[PDB]
From a paper:
Hantaan virus is a dangerous human pathogen whose segmented negative-stranded RNA genome is replicated and transcribed by a virally-encoded multi-functional polymerase. It catalyzes two fundamental steps of the viral cycle: replication that results in the duplication of the viral genome, and transcription that generates viral messenger RNA (mRNA). The interior of the core adopts a right-hand organization that is common to all RNA-dependent RNA polymerases (RdRp) and comprises a palm, a finger, and a thumb domains. The active site cavity is located in the core center at the intersection of four tunnels: the RNA template entry, the nucleotide entry, the template exit, and the product exit tunnels.
Residue numbers in the entry:
A (entry chain C): 1863 to 1910
B (entry chain D): 1 to 216
C (entry chain D): 800 to 944
D (entry chain D): 1766 to 1823, 1830 to 1862
E (entry chain C): 2028 to 2151
F (entry chain D): 2056 to 2151
G (entry chain D): 1187 to 1620
H (entry chain C): 1428 to 1475
Write the structure that this text describes.
Amino acid sequence: IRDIRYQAVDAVSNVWFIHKGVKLYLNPIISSGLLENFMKNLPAAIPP
Amino acid sequence: MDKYREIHNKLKEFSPGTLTAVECIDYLDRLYAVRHDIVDQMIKHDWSDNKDSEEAIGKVLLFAGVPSNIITALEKKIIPNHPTGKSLKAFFKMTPDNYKISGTTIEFVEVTVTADVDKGIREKKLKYEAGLTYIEQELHKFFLKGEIPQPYKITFNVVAVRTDGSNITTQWPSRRNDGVVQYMRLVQAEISYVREHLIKTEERAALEAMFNLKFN
Amino acid sequence: VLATKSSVVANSILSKNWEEPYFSQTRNISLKGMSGQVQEDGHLSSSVTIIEAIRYLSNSRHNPSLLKLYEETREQKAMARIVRKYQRTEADRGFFITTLPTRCRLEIIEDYYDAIAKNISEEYISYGGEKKILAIQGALEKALR
Amino acid sequence: MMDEVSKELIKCGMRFNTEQVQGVRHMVLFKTESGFEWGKPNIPCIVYKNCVLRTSLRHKFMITIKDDGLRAIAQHDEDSPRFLLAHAFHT
Amino acid sequence: GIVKILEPVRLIKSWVSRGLSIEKVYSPVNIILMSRYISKTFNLSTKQVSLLDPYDLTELESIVRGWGECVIDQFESLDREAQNMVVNKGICPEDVIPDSLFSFRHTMVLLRRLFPQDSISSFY
Amino acid sequence: VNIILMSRYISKTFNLSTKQVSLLDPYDLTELESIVRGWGECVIDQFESLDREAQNMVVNKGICPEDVIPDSLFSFRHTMVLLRRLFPQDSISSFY
Amino acid sequence: KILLGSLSDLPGLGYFDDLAAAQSRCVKALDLGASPQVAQLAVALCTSKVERLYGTAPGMVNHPAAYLQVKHTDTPIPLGGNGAMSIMELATAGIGMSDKNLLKRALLGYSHKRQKSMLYILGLFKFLMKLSDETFQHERLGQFSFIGKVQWKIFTPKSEFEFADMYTSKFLELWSSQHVTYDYIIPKGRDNLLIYLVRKLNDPSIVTAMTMQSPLQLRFRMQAKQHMKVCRLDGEWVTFREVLAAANSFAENYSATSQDMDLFQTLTSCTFSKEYAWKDFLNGIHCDVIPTKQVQRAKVARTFTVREKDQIIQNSIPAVIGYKFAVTVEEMSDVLDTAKFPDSLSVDLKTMKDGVYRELGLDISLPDVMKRIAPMLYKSSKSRVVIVQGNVEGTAEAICRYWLKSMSLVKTIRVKPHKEVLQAVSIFNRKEDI
Amino acid sequence: EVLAAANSFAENYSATSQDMDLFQTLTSCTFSKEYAWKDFLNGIHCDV
Amino acid sequence: GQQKDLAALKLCIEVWRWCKANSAPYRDWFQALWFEDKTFSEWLDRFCR
Amino acid sequence: YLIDVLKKTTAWHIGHLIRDITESLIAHSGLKRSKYWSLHSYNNGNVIL
Amino acid sequence: AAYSLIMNRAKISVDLFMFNDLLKLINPRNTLDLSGLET
């Protein structure tokens, strides 16, 4: 399926992800409009 | 003084966050001018020298009985220690804030109001004392050659007063410290006020850049 | 002739803006060819002005001015080379490419002389584009008279 | 100026020559509802004859103020005739 | 259609870069004015920061970012200047802006949500 | 209820027994009368029940005194700046 | 020299860019002294060559009419377009003026009556803008003017240049988005200037200029002739036919919006620089043949300027735009250094906002609004030198009139509207008027 | 007199964006039904 | 209105598909993610209704 | 006086033929197609490439 | 109300008096010092 608006996704509460015991906070990704970049393993630039 | 009253009258009618950056800059410049003027006035009344208008170094020497011919001859000379190689004529053109003549001794004082006392002191020294000492050697050589009956003595004293006036009495043990420090405390409030209040939040960066270029 | 135009000559020389950063101007980040550094094989490398500017900016810690850049690279020996591929740019005129310090020195000399020469352009030097015809027309009028 | 010249002609015993035409090919002085204008009128109106627009015809004064500052009269020198310099009683 | 992620830590680390920081113009005096306002009005020693919501904590850190970088190094002089400005003349505790990114309402509502206070004291 | 809440707020925040209203500027008095018009007609006749309801609403859950809307023609910013200008307050206290 | 060099070199940046380069240098040849007829012949030859190379002409695969329900003439230039404009409009109006005229006609048609063939053109323009808003924003700044264009592939490695592979593409994009003031002013400090230069090095136009006389350019030509993946449709490489099909699909189901109408009018409306209205000047002009023998005079070079700067704004438009967009201290220092009148920057910005609000309902206070509308409002102020024969005055009107009288190689031509019909108009011109 | 005043007003009439917008709005939206009926009447063929 | 519902449904489809490919809190995320002016849980409720 | 005169010239058609030949040669110049043989003909089989 | 404000402008409106009564009910000694007439 194409024409998916990942930039329109908004984060209201805390968003958490678990990967091999590693806890990740995806709320800044949603706020930065980089949902698609992490969605399909695509390059991006983030502040440290 | 009355300048502070006019500034306060102009600035009590401005709502917070309604002044353009350039307006804030020139109001601040006026306020620093007022602070410098009130310190000049405290020193004025301390020395009781009613020299309302600043006079040039050549004019001060003329008031000291120095003949004009030797001054004209010296105008052609050049300061060897001047950082910019300015001529003696331009150094005579400039007017110190205050002066005093007592017999053969002339006292020159430059006053600045800033937080960094040492930086202002050294800046005023590198601006004044080189030419002052060159003039001192020139007049000493003239006295040795016999064109003046009595040698002249020159003294340069620079005093910097912090923005809070804590050390103003230490440098200037005057009787009038209280009123002057109260007045100067007010100017700080006014400057800080317009600087961080009447200024617009969309032009704070513009104000910071203009302040850095003008004063730093 | 130049002594009667001292004020304008001084103004023209001072208006060349010797205090601005060297690499902030367009002419020093253009695509004109420029010799690079000596490679391992011993042959000078053909490069571009923008690449050499980037190299110097990467090696240096600040963006120096024209005078500062000349002072920093004063001891550097001037080097020159003939282009690998001719022209390669609409602004590339000539057959030789030099190094960055050489370009800096030639720029200093060229700017100073252009400033000192643009003032007498009304009579002797025919500056193209705007007043090229005027000096030659005056000379021809004097000759015919 | 039309009023002044009309008064002068009335004092002299004649009146303006007025012709009602639907259009004039040349520049003539014509009177409309809004006033007097110069040009070529293409509308049936009143055109004043013997009117020529001559563009080729193209200092210290003292002012006396009356009506608390509503009308002004000026003249060249003390002996000059008095004329109404300005007035605010317009529409 | 179907995508699988096996190295998300390295995926994020590949995105890490410097220079893309949104700096804001700080007002050194105004920052400490709002600091004094918050300290006086609100009791920050009631609820532990550990149990606070990370969603609100991130916003609080973002709105407080870089506040002390201009006032921690120079504190006594800035405090003296602020005291002179606040005593020599009246200053509105709301019109003052610490930095361009600061938003008043949002800051107060977030502070009240994080640190609830009894409205009877404000009213009665 | 919002009328009585905002009235109490104004009562506590500002000291209204300092400057005589007779010598106040008519231009500002007009605007104050405009923004306070009709408040009395809704609360004087029935006050105790309204005051108890206001207490009940404000004590249980928090109320921010910048969102209370006494009527449809009320602006917090304009009313507060008008009241600041009419009745000066020493800003030193707020920051000290 | 320019006429014969217009042929061999292939910019390889796409149909629109190659066509624009050929037309612009034909205009330059006309400036150096070429007759308008020879310039027109050269324009036709270069247009035919580029159309055949890209397949745009009717008779082969890449013809737009086979994939769009719009006339060949009405298709936007970035798509399959007809670059057979008169040399007069190219020299006087500009290069991308065909798209502007098409958009103006489409908006005029959309009013009065609400048809579908014109809303189709509006949808095509919106699709072009959507494609354009996926690359560097400074590409639209400077160079030829365009509403939007299709991006084409770069068939050369990035490792050829030593310092290209220092900052990643995503790094450069995010730095450009964060630092938008550097699109209009050149950074001074090395920290920003190095990134600016690295971004400049990766520019496709500059890359092609650096590889202009290299065998690597044959790659793009062979890919284009074979009709392979050369364009972009979303994050994937697509063929030109796919771009045409996507444009048709987007335009057939496009709904007009009030904000979209305002932005289209922003494109159609006046400019920040005083521009002469060449369209109505040429439409209302008339030339008459006078039976007088041709007289060969000398040659003199005159400065033909088409875009001036409003005198009310004491600072250059890039300086004011960068000052508005500058949020960091060092950006402010750079814009103050570049600006000749730093104290009047706030006044110029206020007048800019007031003029925009007066002529348009759009408010530049919001950073997004000014960011989107600035490139379509500010255009470059490049000056040109045109070789003229006789007493042609140093004004744009005089140069244009000389070109009109120069259409006939033998017959003397007289222009009936001999009065001054200049239309020096700007956004703030109407403000000064009211 | 009314006719003469109308002629005087109309001879010097200058186009206005607001007036043009109003006329466009009328002729395109307000009188739409009337023009629809007019087009109905125009585009009908009757054979005897 | 149909286009917005279609977009919301497609976004939900994609996010759930990825959450199933990985290990994610489906219900928690559907109560946190927001589309337009409707949360994902409300979007699912509307789709059901 | 130029295009009409030169249209009937032999040089016009010769140039067009050379253009077609150059197009074919450029097509063969690809990296894949370079190391293989090829054959083309033009003008009713009169000219063979 | 506009007529009353225009003509007199020296007598406060009944709205201000009612507001003063409300303030007295809430907390006396913090009321507006009223010395003008009504209407």
